């Protein structure tokens, strides 16, 4: 019974965003604590918000001796810790 209630609470709770993400294979963007952002598709998740992410594009912001420039790179198979997550946004 306990397992059931846990999965259900997960389903109708805030986690529903990441659950929806995996089932729809939709892209989501993740604001992290490193001040880097990860837009990707959710392959797997965890109660800690540990995740396996595919088609990762991380965007970030760097300062140089002139105007601030945004920098970005593609990481196809990315596994991510759960405490780095500030926010997970789901959008069209």
């Amino acid at each position: 019974e306990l397992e059931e209630l846990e999965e259900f609470e997960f389903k109708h709770g805030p986690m529903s965003l990441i659950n929806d993400a995996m089932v729809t294979r939709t892209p989501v963007i993740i604001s992290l604590r490193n001040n880097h952002k990860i837009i990707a598709r959710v392959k797997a998740f965890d109660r800690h918000c540990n995740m396996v992410l595919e088609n990762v594009k991380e965007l970030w912001t760097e300062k140089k001796g002139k105007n601030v420039i945004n920098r970005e790179r593609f990481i196809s198979k990315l596994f991510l810790r759960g405490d780095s997550v500030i926010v997970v946004l789901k959008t069209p």
């Binding site: 805030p14 500030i86 946004l89």
Partner: protein, 73 residues
Amino acid sequence: PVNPKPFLKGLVNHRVGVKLKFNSTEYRGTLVSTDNYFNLQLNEAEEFVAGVSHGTLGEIFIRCNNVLYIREL
């Protein structure tokens, strides 16, 4: 006793805003749901950084740990 959990349950389905500990980000949106560990789900979210609108994010998840406080708007 009126506990934070019932106050928050009553706050569900209402326009809220949440100030994180960083204060670098506030989020104003409808409060869809909150779990027992107090992670936050908002919809139609709007981001206010330094008190100014950064943009409209939409359906958003907030890690419990980052939450400083939540207020109703």
